[PDB]
Amino acid sequence: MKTLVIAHRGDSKNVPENTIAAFKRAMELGADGIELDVQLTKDGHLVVIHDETVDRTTNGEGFVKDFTLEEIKKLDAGIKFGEKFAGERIPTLYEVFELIGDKDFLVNIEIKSGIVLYPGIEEKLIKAIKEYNFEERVIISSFNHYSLRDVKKMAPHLKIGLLYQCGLVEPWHMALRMEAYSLHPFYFNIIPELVEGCKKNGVKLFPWTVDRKEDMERMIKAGVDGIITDDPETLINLVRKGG
């Protein structure tokens, strides 16, 4: 079967990352899903943005956790990438679910693991996913596997993906013990031994971030379940073999 194309922060190569515009473009291109990052505002709302600070992607400055939802919505998350995207905002998580609707589109949600701690984010994320009936279409990932352990304990039916860059040997044992749906390794880790071990144990593989054509071709040949990429258009054409 075809490898799934997961657009990293939407079609981030051509559209401002982590915006409804970028996620919508990924859907239009024919991607199988999207990868996104969730954080909490000061008043406890789930917003979609990668960095702990709004500095890089917006016309504002300061930590995401210091902004209230109303305040963070005044920022422009599109202008830093192009004049054509002026006025594009930092989405809430609800907006992403509302954009997709009932469509069969995978949403790989990453809970952050940096210096900024997010108390109660697991409970809030679980409630939001259940409210919009996205239980089956979501994979909750994180580099903080303790957070995923809490998610699995509080909502066993939700799928968790273990993100890692570390060059782990036989990581499928850990994955099975944590009841993880998938392993999300930095693409350098994708080698025959890892693929075979995961396939023999039913553990899915979602390598990231694959942007170069040569690496995309190797990931498809390796036979991974899905590829997280900033360039869905190029990967889709390779996966579809020009069709």
Contact positions toward its own copies, by CB under 8 A? 113-115, 142-147, 149, 163-170, 173-174, 177-178, 188
122 binds, among its own copies, Ca ion, none (CB under 5 to 8 A by kind): none
User: Is 45 one of the catalytic residues?
Assistant: no
Nearer to Ca ion, 71 or 168 (CB): 168
User: Is 173 one of the catalytic residues?
Assistant: no
Nearer to Ca ion, 37 or 51 (CB): 37
Q: How far is the CB of 114 from Ca ion (least distance, A)?
A: 11
Q: Is 83 annotated as a binding residue?
A: no
Q: Is 158 exposed, middle or buried (0-12, 13-18, 19+ CB in 10 A)?
A: buried
d(C-alpha 138, C-alpha 159), whole Å: 7
The token pair that represents 23 in the structure block: 């996620």
Q: How far is the CB of 150 from its own copies (least distance, A)?
A: 10
37 binds, among its own copies, Ca ion, none (CB under 5 to 8 A by kind): Ca ion
d(C-alpha 59, C-alpha 174), whole Å: 42
Describe the crossing of helices 121-131 and 93-100 by its angle, rounded to 10 degrees.
Answer: 20
147 binds, among its own copies, Ca ion, none (CB under 5 to 8 A by kind): its own copies
Considering the candidates 8, 45, 145, 184, report the single residue annotated as catalytic: 8
Contact residues toward Ca ion (CB under 5 A) are 37, 110
Q: How far is the CB of 42 from its own copies (least distance, A)?
A: 22
Nearer to Ca ion, 7 or 158 (CB): 7
Q: How far does CA 37 lie from the centroid of its chain?
A: 6
The token pair that represents 137 in the structure block: 């279409």
DSSP 34-75: EEEEEEE-TT--EEE-SSSBSTTTSS--SBGGGS-HHHHTTS
Q: Is 110 annotated as a binding residue?
A: yes
Q: Give the CA count within 13 Å in the CB-facing half-sphere of 34.
A: 29
Considering the candidates 45, 50, 145, 184, report the single residue annotated as catalytic: 50
Q: Is 98 annotated as a binding residue?
A: no
Closest CA to 193 of 174, 176, 170: 170
d(C-alpha 59, C-alpha 90), whole Å: 11
14 binds, among Ca ion, its own copies, none (CB under 5 to 8 A by kind): none
Nearer to its own copies, 101 or 146 (CB): 146
Cite the active site residues.
Answer: 8, 50
* Binding site members: 35, 37, 110
* Binding site members for Ca(2+): 35, 37, 110
